[PDB]
């Protein structure tokens, strides 16, 4: 008797919406990655996207403890020999505050084609309003 | 109406009229076999140590060997190689009673 595996057609992902105001970033970002992956479901199977669609709202109001607002640096390299550009947390909140949740969640999702598809179900909005009224997202209280 | 019993060092969850493959029991083909140690009978209503009087009674179908596994042992650069085949004995039982 083989162990149950969920199928990528019979899986039904539900839509959730999350207000990220005042939340600690990687405490927020690890429950997002838990439910993007689908580990909160008994139907979890590690080769199938079984997760949810999560709408993150008010991404710019996400919080970090300590001195991390001015001292957490985001390093990326551009492929050219100068390359090593860097932005602190408060510079990242000004330029693209959506990127802070998206970078933090992406390190917690698995690496490969599947974890790149689990990232597709994270809809991050800087403001207080999304466009996905038609998908009827339930409020997911963190 | 399924139940959990435990036969060949492993536990199985069977329903009625289902064949389950177990380890090689030494009872002849066609004999009713009781599994008095039933871990959990469930239905609309469930019963869970062991149950007190629920017995899975099955009926022995066939005594075969499994699909052959090749055991290959290899140690690179150390002049060592060892092949071995394995077919594992099983016993198929059709479940004819969940009490």
């Amino acid at each position: 008797m083989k162990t149950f595996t969920a199928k990528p057609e019979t899986v039904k992902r539900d839509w959730y919406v999350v207000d990220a105001t005042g939340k600690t970033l990687g405490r927020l970002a690890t429950e997002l990655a838990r439910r993007l992956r689908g580990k909160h479901k008994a139907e979890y199977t590690p080769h199938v996207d079984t997760g949810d669609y999560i709408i993150v709202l008010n991404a710019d109001k996400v919080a970090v403890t300590g001195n991390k607002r001015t001292d957490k640096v985001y390093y990326h390299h551009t492929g050219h020999i100068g390359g090593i550009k860097q932005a602190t947390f408060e510079e990242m909140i000004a330029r693209r505050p959506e990127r802070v949740i998206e970078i933090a969640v992406k390190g917690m999702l698995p690496k490969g084609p599947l974890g790149r598809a689990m990232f597709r179900k994270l809809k991050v909005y800087a403001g207080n309003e999304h466009n996905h009224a038609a998908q009827q997202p339930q409020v997911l209280d963190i | 109406m399924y139940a959990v019993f435990q036969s060949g060092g492993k536990q199985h969850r069977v329903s009625e009229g289902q064949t389950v493959r177990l380890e090689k029991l030494d009872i002849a083909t066609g004999e009713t076999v009781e599994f008095a140690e039933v871990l959990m009978i469930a239905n609309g209503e469930e019963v869970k140590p062991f149950v007190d009087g629920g017995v899975i009674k099955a009926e022995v179908v066939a005594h075969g060997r499994g699909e052959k596994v090749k055991i290959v042992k290899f140690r690179r650069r150390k002049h060592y190689r060892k092949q071995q085949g394995h077919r594992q004995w099983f016993t198929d039982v059709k479940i004819t009673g969940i009490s």
């Binding site: 580990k39 139907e43 199977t45 | 969850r13 469930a42 469930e46 090749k70 092949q83």
Partner: protein
């Protein structure tokens, strides 16, 4: 008694190229490459008969952990609560219940939550 060895070397080579079906490129056609493809593929098959019993126990434990947390308990307290209650169901069947008969799992969690605390 000269012995020509074309017949039994063909068969010995053909036996190994038959075990190499589906392999990419010269690993299906060339004997030298296909021999150590087949020897490596038997090496992996030995190793992943060990890893199969771990990867499924990994998969059950991750599903009981999810299905316990829908019923409001962690995997650790559910497995401790089952052992204090002397329930001897293994994790293969505990995960099988968790997707197929959820109301037979909420009864198991209750029988664990009771006898734990």
């Amino acid at each position: 008694a000269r012995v020509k060895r074309g017949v039994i070397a063909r068969a010995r080579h053909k036996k190994i190229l038959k075990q190499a079906k589906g392999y990419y490129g010269a690993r299906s056609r060339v004997y030298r490459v296909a021999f150590q493809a087949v020897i490596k593929a038997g090496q992996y098959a030995y190793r992943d008969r060990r890893q199969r019993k771990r990867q499924f126990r990994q998969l059950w434990i991750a599903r009981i952990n999810a299905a316990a947390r829908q019923n409001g308990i962690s995997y650790s307290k559910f497995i401790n609560g089952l052992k204090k209650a002397s329930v001897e169901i293994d994790r293969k069947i505990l995960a099988d219940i968790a997707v197929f008969d959820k109301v037979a799992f909420t009864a198991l969690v209750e029988k664990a939550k009771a006898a734990l605390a």
